């Protein structure tokens, strides 16, 4: 469980992300695809992205990144009470997109990299620790739901 202070650090930095959801979403997905290129194979329209500049110019990539950050933001604002928000995400990610927990670890690392790149002054050790605990709780709860739906990935 997170402390109230740890939640407040997570939501403080999240309010910075919300100043430019699209740009943060682009940088997070570009970092994910650069660091772990196998992840580009999870959506057919993304095999066409061969350069960083094409990734930055893709309206499709930018809209995907806003959808990710919008859903994750709503989950983090529930401060752990996120069953109703997490269930549908687990359903689609386990049964349709087939995203393994290791790929949710990859995108978590990219989220931490971008938040520290853009907001170092508001993302020091305590804030990084709080965000890492919040993303750990997200991945733990989503994996339990994956298993309830019969997906062991
Ligand atoms: C913080 C983690 C993530 C969140 C909150 C998130 C959220 C979402 C949401 C809200 C959608 C649209 C609704 C849906 O189908 O569920 C979506 C679709 C999708 N996600 Fe994720 N996602 C996450 C991580 C990933 C990762 C790591 C991958 C691939 C490696 C991925 C692949 C997909 C695909 C292929 C779709 C459908 C895209 C489309 O049809 O245009 N997701 N995700
Ligand atoms: O799977 C792929 C390949 C490239 C791309 O943009 N995505 C994607 C990632 C996360 C997401 O939520 C939606 C789509």
UniProtKB/Swiss-Prot annotation:
GO terms for biological process: removal of superoxide radicals. The keyword Iron-sulfur does not apply. Heme b binds at residue 93. Nitrite binds at residue 64. Changing residue 121 to A: In metmyoglobin. GO terms for molecular function: heme binding; metal ion binding; nitrite reductase activity; oxygen binding; oxygen carrier activity; peroxidase activity. It catalyses: Fe(III)-heme b-[protein] + nitric oxide + H2O = Fe(II)-heme b-[protein] + nitrite + 2 H(+); H2O2 + AH2 = A + 2 H2O. The keyword Membrane does not apply. Keywords: Cytoplasm, Heme, Iron, Metal-binding, Muscle protein, Oxidoreductase, Oxygen transport, Phosphoprotein, Transport. SUPFAM superfamilies: Globin-like. Its EC number is 1.7.-.-, 1.11.1.-. The modification Phosphoserine is found at residue 3. It is an enzyme of class 1 (oxidoreductase). GO terms for cellular component: extracellular exosome; sarcoplasm. Residues 1-147 form the Globin domain. InterPro entries: Globin, Globin-like_sf, Myoglobin. It is found in: Cytoplasm, Sarcoplasm. O2 binds at residue 64. The modification Phosphothreonine is found at residue 67. Its main location: cytoplasm. Monomeric heme protein which primary function is to store oxygen and facilitate its diffusion within muscle tissues. Reversibly binds oxygen through a pentacoordinated heme iron and enables its timely and efficient release as needed during periods of heightened demand. Depending on the oxidative conditions of tissues and cells, and in addition to its ability to bind oxygen, it also has a nitrite reductase activity whereby it regulates the production of bioactive nitric oxide. Belongs to the globin family. Monomeric. This is Myoglobin. It comes from Physeter macrocephalus.
């Amino acid at each position: 469980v997170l402390s109230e202070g740890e939640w407040q650090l997570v939501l403080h930095v999240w309010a910075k992300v919300e100043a430019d959801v699209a740009g943060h979403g682009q940088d997070i997905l570009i970092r994910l695809f650069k660091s772990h290129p196998e992840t580009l194979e999870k959506f057919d329209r993304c095999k066409h992205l061969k350069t960083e500049a094409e990734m930055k110019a893709s309206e499709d990539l930018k809209k995907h990144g806003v959808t990710v950050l919008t859903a994750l933001g709503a989950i983090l604002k529930k401060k752990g009470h996120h069953e109703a928000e997490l269930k549908p995400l687990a359903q689609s990610h386990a049964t349709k997109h087939k995203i393994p927990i290791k790929y949710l670890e990859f995108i978590s690392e990219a989220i931490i990299h971008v938040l520290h790149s853009r907001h170092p002054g508001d993302f020091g050790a305590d804030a990084q620790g709080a965000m890492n605990k919040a993303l750990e709780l997200f991945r733990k709860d989503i994996a339990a739901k994956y298993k309830e739906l019969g997906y062991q990935g």
